[PDB]
Symmetry: C3
Subunit: 29 residues, 3 copies
Amino acid sequence: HSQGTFTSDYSKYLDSKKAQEFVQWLMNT
Amino acid sequence: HSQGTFTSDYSKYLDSKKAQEFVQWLMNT
Amino acid sequence: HSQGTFTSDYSKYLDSKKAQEFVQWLMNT
């Protein structure tokens, strides 16, 4: 309800940027 | 004492920047 | 084997950059 969801949401785009890092890492120019 | 606190401290400014991200996200231009 | 290691690896360089932050913090110009 009231607070009935947004973190039980958004938090993967975070993991989506933590993914770009694994290649930011498995690569980086 | 000796090591008697600094991480049982500082670690929220981290959460303070993780907050700017929720709007970096709940917004971003 | 097959998936027999890379995360049971890489993940500290992450902590290595989280270290630069503790001084990015225990300092910053």
